[PDB]
């Protein structure tokens, strides 16, 4: 029919939009479909691993800030 011809074209555009966000495949026209899916999957897991690392870095820095302020207040009060 005419519907699946439009559904296959929108699927093809969706593949390009996902591919143009993976830095390894960006604007790579020859990237197969299974490569777009597996590189998108590995990239998504990497930015989820980054979020965890940054939240961990953030938490330690916040812990140091309140300990440096407590140290400063103790020194100012001798």
């Amino acid at each position: 029919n005419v519907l699946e011809r439009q559904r296959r074209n929108e699927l093809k555009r969706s593949f390009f939009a996902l591919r143009d966000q993976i830095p390894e495949l960006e604007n790579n026209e020859k990237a197969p479909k299974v490569v777009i899916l597996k590189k998108a999957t590995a990239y998504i897991l990497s930015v989820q691993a980054e979020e965890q690392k940054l939240i961990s870095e953030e938490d330690l820095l916040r812990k140091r800030r309140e300990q440096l302020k407590h140290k400063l207040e103790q020194l100012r009060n001798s």
Binding site: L37, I44, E51, R65
Partner: protein, 68 residues
């Protein structure tokens, strides 16, 4: 290869949290993964800039504790 495309679709789908407990279409799997990558890039950037601010604040507090 088409069974591997099916498995890789399922693997991409399971890694996107907004798609938990839903069997979205292939177009919806790709669209939500693209949106999720967008969301996470801006989220990690904001976090990295927050960590930059904390390093500078802590560097100043260290200089205040020193000299005292």
């Amino acid at each position: 290869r088409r069974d591997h495309i099916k498995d890789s679709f399922h693997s991409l789908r399971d890694s996107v949290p907004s798609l938990q407990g839903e069997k979205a279409s292939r177009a919806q799997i790709l669209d939500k993964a693209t949106e999720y990558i967008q969301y996470m890039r801006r989220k990690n950037h904001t976090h990295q800039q927050d960590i930059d601010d904390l390093k500078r604040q802590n560097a100043l507090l260290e200089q205040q504790v020193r000299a005292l």
